[PDB]
């Protein structure tokens, strides 16, 4: 049951936009809402509006009086001397709650005229006509006007609706909540050479009487929220999908072949999401818009998605096809379960984010294989076991503070840190995988189909929300639908992993009792760490003995420590028979390293990742080597690679080398075995016999049979030896001499890989392989032996580093004439120049990176150069570079770059709270408090980034370096 927090119900909204002026960056328009009051004596009506100048408001064609105030413009007063962050977080939460449409509130308060009170008490319709104007919007909407001359279509000027969650208040007045569903009528009067893309279906396109402008009329009969309404106006090249004909793809001019190749996969994503769920795609059209200077890499609205143009690749670009493919896939998953089925509160957001991430993981499983699914699930779980042990924990479904271990309030999406938002979505889809583990996948897809079917029977009624609230899901409704389809309720699992905000830590060690033939496990939990919680459920453990692989369920109550499980025979060591594996197959194992008295080959605690856990198991090194070689699970091979770094014995070198030589191993395991072999090789110097590690293996796999030092000409058509070939010198460059210097046998090998590179024969580009070669050249740089702080000049350069510097100069200059796909070699060469500057080789001068961080460059070059400037101002304690970065945060045209500068200055801070630095003035505290209070008031993501930066630099209490 859904009861509105608003005293009115909104039925229909007309959004008309005229006079989109690109020179002056200005729009004019009106908005006409059709509300039905649910309570008599409505009097004031409270709507949401930011940055719009409200000209006049007429209610039922009668002139009404409005008052506007935004408490989130300046959160605390300018003349308050408070400088602690808990004060700002409480004041910011109160300010966002005072404009919240999820309460009754709002920023624009319109007073109902007196003569309509007899029209409002007996509950009859009210039609509110606001007309507004955006004069020059800051972050309200995306504006991109290039400085080439010509007409606005000839220079490539486009508009996007930027922002996240409820950010539609930034460009027209609305009820900007996900719970106020209404039908829509959208008119946009644009230039005759431009096209206006928006939500709904385009019913017509009429000309103006001078035929210089045309009006696009859109209609949206599926009741969506105001927060799902978007807009993209530009000179877009239109491409109808040749497979599905209601899907149109819009790109920027001159990028039509890239659009043709890139969006050619999307029909398979549509077919997948419509056959695992049994509902068809709910909207009547689908539109993909590719734009410049995007807010996020992929945004999903109702019947529309806005991607950045940096996803567009051609047919000869690999290492970008899977990333763009999965961006399209998660936009479509959010089309199904973020835009059609919406949110009932700010709680129950974990339901939608979990269903979106879970069905996108099912797509990844079918498309890229289970191996890639398991690797992705493990990397998401490690991300969580790192973030939650780092700071507190992520609390899905809080109850309204519920989480007081973090420096922000979790009551609203616009007060969350961006890393918390990312980890929120990550934990939501892992908890949905856990619900699939308890209640099987076909019942899970039946739950999702029942939600979609209730929403689509709801979506066709005309009753103003008598039935339109069946399109809003809640937690209680989701659990009730689960209990309807399965008969089991998941309330212990919901109580543990949703309502409780923690992950578990397992420390395991075994001992084999030879007398009674049992395996005595010893599993203890660390439940006193700040991020942890105590697990009391069951726990699966998989033991591989000589007779095969056996699963055991252990009951781990609070007082439990020793778990005795039984062991089988050892009669497959009496005769040589094959040892049967986890799957149905069996292999020949070399049992010379195994103990004579124990049959068990390896043990895995929680193999299926059925809890949110971090396992620290103490096996013997031969058990880790057997688990690396003969396991049929990629996460166990990865964890054995990760655990073999502590055992540098030559049997582990043989194990990793046998993994590296082995095709029919998953390629991301071999790419990890490269770096593990490099670390082991560095640890057993003065024992290593022959050549450096992986060199003979590289010449055996990727070089000519007649010439060992000449590499084969590039043929990248295998896509697994391509990735292994481009990752093996990067790990090989981490080899170190006894003298702690990279050997001149590996550096010469990398330089010969660079010289003899011929790419005139493959059908694929070479930009990522050459960029990884520059990364391998940067990995070999050891710190220089400066004497008496000698100035680093050209004559006293290292003889090794002169070759590296010549190569990166040649590569960067050749990129200036023949550019790569996304300037990958510019990014790699800037990163390598920063590596050479971090050691004492090149003079520590930020002027090159400051010239590459200007506005007109590509955004990857810009963020690489700004990363180099952030690293410089951390190491050299530069005041003027920090003022340069803070000025670039305040006034840069691209808001993604501002968010990225705040993000990089949070990750690599110039000082922490423990450090005494010269940069801890009262002036810097006043600048960052002014940046939290004012200055970042237009983005909701810069303000949370400024809160994160103030927390990283000065902590939760009063800045110490202050009177």
């Amino acid at each position: 049951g859904f009861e509105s927090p608003r005293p009115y119900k909104l039925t229909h909204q007309v959004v008309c936009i005229n006079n989109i002026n690109f020179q002056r960056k200005s729009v004019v328009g009106f908005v006409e809402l059709t509300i039905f009051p649910t309570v008599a004596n409505l009097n004031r009506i409270k709507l949401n509006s930011k940055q719009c100048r409200i000209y006049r408001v007429r209610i039922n064609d009668l002139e009404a009086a409005f008052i506007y105030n935004d408490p989130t413009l300046e959160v605390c007063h300018s003349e308050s001397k408070q400088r602690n962050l808990n004060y700002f977080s409480n004041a910011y939460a109160a300010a966002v709650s005072a404009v919240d449409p999820d309460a009754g509130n709002g920023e624009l308060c319109i007073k109902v005229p007196s003569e309509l009170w007899k029209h409002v008490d007996e509950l009859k319709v009210l039609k509110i006509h606001i007309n507004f104007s955006l004069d020059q919007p800051k972050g309200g909407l995306h504006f991109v006007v290039p400085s080439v001359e010509g007409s606005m279509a000839e220079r490539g000027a486009h508009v996007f609706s930027c922002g996240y969650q409820n950010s539609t208040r930034f460009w027209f007045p609305c009820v900007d909540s996900y719970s106020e569903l209404c039908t829509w009528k959208l008119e946009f009067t644009v230039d005759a050479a431009m096209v206006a893309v928006s939500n709904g279906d385009l019913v017509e396109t009429v000309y103006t009487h001078d035929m210089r402008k045309k009006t696009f009329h859109y209609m949206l009969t599926i009741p969506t929220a105001a927060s799902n309404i978007s807009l993209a106006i530009g000179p877009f090249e239109i491409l109808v999908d040749p497979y599905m004909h209601e899907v149109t793809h819009f790109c920027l001019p001159q990028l039509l072949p890239l659009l043709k190749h890139t969006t050619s996969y999307l029909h398979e994503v549509f077919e997948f999401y419509e056959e695992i769920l049994t509902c068809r795609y709910p909207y009547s059209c689908f539109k993909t818009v590719f734009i410049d200077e995007a807010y996020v890499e992929v945004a999903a609205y109702a019947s529309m998605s806005i991607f950045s143009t940096n996803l567009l690749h051609s047919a000869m670009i690999i290492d970008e096809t899977p990333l763009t493919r999965r961006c399209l896939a998660q936009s479509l998953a959010q089309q199904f379960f973020g835009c059609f089925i919406s949110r009932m509160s700010w709680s129950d957001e974990w339901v939608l984010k979990g269903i979106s991430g879970y069905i996108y993981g099912l797509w990844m499983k079918k498309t890229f294989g289970v191996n890639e699914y398991r690797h992705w699930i493990k990397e998401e779980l490690d991300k969580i076991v790192a973030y939650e042990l780092k700071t507190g924990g992520v609390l899905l479904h809080p109850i309204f503070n519920p989480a007081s271990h973090l420096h922000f309030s979790i009551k609203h999406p616009h007060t969350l840190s961006w890393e918390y938002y990312s980890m929120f979505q990550c934990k939501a889809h892992l908890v949905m995988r856990l619900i699939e583990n308890r209640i099987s996948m076909e019942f899970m897809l039946q739950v999702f189909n029942k939600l979609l079917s209730l929403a689509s029977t709801a979506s066709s009624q005309k009753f103003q929300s008598h039935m339109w609230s069946q399109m809003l899901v809640s937690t209680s409704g989701f659990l009730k639908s689960i209990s309807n389809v399965s008969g089991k309720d998941i309330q212990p699992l919901i109580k543990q992993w949703v309502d409780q905000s923690g992950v578990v830590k397992f420390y395991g060690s075994f001992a084999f009792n030879r007398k009674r033939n049992v395996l005595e496990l010893e599993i203890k939990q660390d439940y006193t760490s700040p991020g942890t919680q105590k697990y009391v459920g069951p726990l699966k453990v998989t033991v591989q003995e000589l007779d095969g692989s056996f699963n055991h369920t252990l009951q781990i109550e609070e007082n439990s420590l020793k778990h005795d499980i039984p062991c089988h025979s050892k009669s497959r060591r009496n005769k040589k028979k094959k040892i049967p594996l986890m799957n149905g197959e069996e292999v020949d194992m070399d049992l010379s390293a195994m103990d004579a008295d124990s049959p068990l080959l390896w043990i895995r605690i929680d193999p299926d990742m059925s809890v949110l856990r971090k396992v620290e198991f103490e096996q013997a090194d031969f058990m880790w080597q057997y688990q690396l070689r003969y396991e049929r699970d990629v996460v166990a091979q990865q964890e054995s690679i990760l655990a073999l770094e502590k055992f540098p014995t030559p049997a582990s070198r043989l194990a990793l080398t046998d993994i590296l030589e082995q095709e029919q191993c998953f390629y991301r395991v071999r790419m990890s075995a490269c770096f593990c072999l490099a670390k082991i090789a560095n640890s057993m110097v003065s024992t290593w016999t022959g050549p450096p590690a992986m060199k003979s293996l590289f010449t055996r796999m990727f070089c000519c049979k007649s010439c060992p030092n000449i590499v084969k000409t590039n043929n990248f058509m295998s896509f697994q030896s391509y990735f292994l070939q481009k990752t093996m010198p990067v790990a090989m460059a981490l080899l170190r001499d006894v003298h702690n210097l990279c050997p001149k046998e590996v550096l010469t090998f990398i330089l010969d890989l660079i010289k003899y590179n011929d790419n005139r024969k493959n059908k694929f580009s070479d930009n990522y392989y050459r960029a990884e070669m520059i990364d391998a050249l940067a990995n070999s740089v050891t710190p220089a032996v400066s004497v008496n702080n000698e100035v680093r000049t050209l004559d006293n350069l290292n003889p090794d580093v002169r070759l590296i510097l010549e190569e990166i100069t040649r590569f960067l200059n050749m990129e200036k004439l023949l550019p790569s796909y996304r300037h990958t070699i510019t990014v790699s060469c800037l990163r390598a120049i920063r590596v050479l500057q971090k050691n004492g080789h090149v003079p520590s001068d930020p002027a090159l990176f400051k010239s590459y961080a200007e506005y007109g460059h590509f955004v990857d070059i810009r963020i690489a150069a700004l990363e180099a400037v952030v690293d410089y101002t951390k190491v050299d304690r530069s005041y003027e570079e920090l003022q340069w970065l803070l000025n670039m945060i305040q006034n840069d045209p691209v808001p993604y770059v501002r968010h990225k500068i705040l993000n990089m200055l949070t990750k690599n801070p110039p000082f922490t709270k423990n450090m005494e630095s010269p940069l801890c003035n009262e002036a810097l505290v006043d600048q960052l408090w002014k940046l939290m209070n004012s200055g970042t008031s237009h983005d909701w993501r810069l303000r949370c980034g400024a809160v994160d930066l103030y927390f990283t630099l000065f902590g939760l209490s009063r800045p110490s370096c202050l009177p």
């Binding site: 220079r155 990028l255 051609s314 200036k816 550019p819």
Partner: peptide, 25 residues
């Protein structure tokens, strides 16, 4: 200037055209 000369970085008016577009096709 004699040893390791770098061509100076010039800004483009439209940078996606020189970035994303293929030159040999």
């Amino acid at each position: 200037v004699s040893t390791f000369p770098l061509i100076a970085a010039r800004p483009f008016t439209i940078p996606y055209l020189t970035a994303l577009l293929p030159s040999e096709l």
